[PDB]
Ligand SMILES: Nc1nc2c(ncn2[C@@H]2O[C@H](COP(=O)(O)OP(=O)(O)O)[C@@H](O)[C@H]2O)c(=O)[nH]1
């Protein structure tokens with residue numbers, strides 16, 4: 001039989017609103033991550049979507065139909081059992097132009113990504129643009145482009161967009177990114193996408209010796225498939241492990257942590273706890289590693305782990321030395337253009353005293369610019385951030401025409 005292991009790789013699913021990201025995830029995994037009624041009433045889904053699947057291959061059958069997402073070779077007409085390859089998970093990021101912060105939060109978790117392009121819309125739409133550039137800034141360059149909704153366009157219409165997409169990727173880091181046509185709604189050519197995932201999003205090397213760090217995704221910020229148990233021993237803290245491994249009973253801390261307000265002054269103090277359980281889906285494990293959304297069961301009271309007063313951005317081992325900073329210095333670069341705007345706009349230079357939005361790990365922090373000198377800015381944050389390394393790239397956004405627009409990036413200097 002197929003083993004029950006954690007997912008070993010996170011694949012983002014990005015692209016413009018209504019291009020079919022959530023449907024594509026369902027096509028691969030059988031899971032519909034969002035709530036249809038809420039998406040109807042709000043006109044968008046604001047939470048990250050999450051789903052997992054096994055990947056196998058029917059060694060008797062031919063490609064790409066030999067690739068399967070279940071332990072059956074029926075789809076290629078064989079009764080042999082498929083060879084298990086790996087378990088993978090998907091981060092379904094929002095496309096709506098007001099949700100760039102949530103996309104950037106999800107992009108911190110991706111080992112690769114799929115950019116979904118609708119074939120019946122003019123390429124490239126503003127968030128096709130903005131998400132593509134965001135992926136390149138952040139370093140998620142194991143990319144597959146998917147031309148979705150081919151069922152509604154002619155052969156000539158798909159070919160014509162295909163040429164637009166090749167012209168767009170030409171002369172960029174994505175110049176050799178494959179372009180796979182599919183219908184997510186009717187599950188057309190999904191096996192070729194699976195074949196592409198195996199070829200172009202190989203599981204990354206994990207140095208399991210590094211200090212364990214998990215980026216936190218608050219439960220109210222993500223839609224995950226249904227759970228059998230909500231852990232009894234205390235509140236659960238979910239997220240994705242970006243380095244090292246965590247083990248049951250290890251002492252850990254949640255950073256920045258709990259808001260404490262005493263004699264006027266405000267601080268965020270670390271919340272120490274201990275790993276009571278480790279879950280992926282509804283499977284229990286003794287350890288957790290990078291790849292997948294893990295549920296870390298603690299002994300904390302659920303009223304703390306779900307509190308808004310808890311600034312839970314990362315989890316580390318209890319003895320890790322992690323600065324928690326209200327003021328940070330960023331070595332920054334700006335984009336030439338505001339790629340995600342509808343109008344053609346140049347990015348203005350960073351002015352002192354303006355408000356910026358900083359994406360660090362999975363967290364989102366507003367800040368004021370106290371100092372601009374050359375290519376370094378100094379920012380006084382509204383809430384501190386936990387800088388777990390000296391190597392951390394933040395993404396910078398500015399409010400433009402009543403939306404948060406990605407305008408550049410930087411290195412957080414400590
Ligand atoms: N005709 C057709 N419609 C599709 C296809 N994929 C998605 N859709 C429709 O496009 C709309 C938006 O899809 P959705 O998955 O919610 O897009 P998202 O905003 O990117 O998550 C839905 O009404 C889908 O049923 C497709 O392959 N063909």
Ligand SMILES: [Mg+2]
Pocket residue numbers: 021022023034045092
């Ligand atoms: Mg969606």
Ligand SMILES: [Mg+2]
Pocket residue numbers: 185186
């Ligand atoms: Mg149909």
Ligand code: NA
Pocket residue numbers: 150151152153154155158
């Ligand atoms: Na077609």
